[PDB]
Amino acid sequence: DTRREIYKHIVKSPGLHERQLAKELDVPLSTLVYHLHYLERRELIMMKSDERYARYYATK
Amino acid sequence: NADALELDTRREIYKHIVKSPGLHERQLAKELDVPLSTLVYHLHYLERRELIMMKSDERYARYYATK
């Protein structure tokens, strides 16, 4: 039900964020994270860093 | 070889980093009035020279289905 909906929203709409997923499915963030962890542990979904949100610092 | 424009843009970027740490590249571009493509060109260079470092933010990770 909820898990099968989360995995499917990811197949049809690749690249979404954690909070964009919980909004487009009306699933609480805590519930969605538990299912995302299962889907990662089974290697059915993966995870990429968003360059648009990386932060830059000068080195020492 | 590097134009005055390339050197000026590079140094202006590096030291906006020092004066204002932790910004994203779209904020970097709008605050320096530089196109995003050119800014990312200079960020990769400053990172190759280890003058700046790039920290990912995993709160904004993108989710994809495996094949």
Q: At CB < 8 Å, which residues of chain B contact A?
A: 14, 17-18, 21-26, 28, 43, 50-66
Residue A38: both structure tokens together: 């299962």
- Structural gaps in chain B: residues followed by a C–N separation over 2.5 Å: none
**Resolved by:** X-ray
Q: Are strands A55-58 and B52-55 parallel, antiparallel or unpaired?
A: antiparallel
Query: Inter-chain contact A47–B24, Cβ cutoff 8 Å?
Result: no
Based on the structure, what is the number of domains in chain A? 1
Task: Give the structural domain span for B56.
Answer: 1-67
How is A14-54 classified by DSSP, letter by letter? TTB-HHHHHHHTT--HHHHHHHHHHHHHTTSEEEE--GGG-
Give me the resolution in angstroms, 1 decimal: 2.4
Contact indicator for B28, A26 with CB cutoff of 8 Å: no
Query: Inter-chain contact B51–A57, Cβ cutoff 8 Å?
Result: no
Give the CATH number of the domain where residue A52 resides.
1.10.10.10
Query: Inter-chain contact B63–A47, Cβ cutoff 8 Å?
Result: yes
Contact residues on chain A for B55, CB-CB shorter than 8 A: 54-57
- What does the CA dihedral A36, A41, A45, A48 come to, rounded to 10 degrees? 90
Contact indicator for B28, B18 with CB cutoff of 8 Å: no
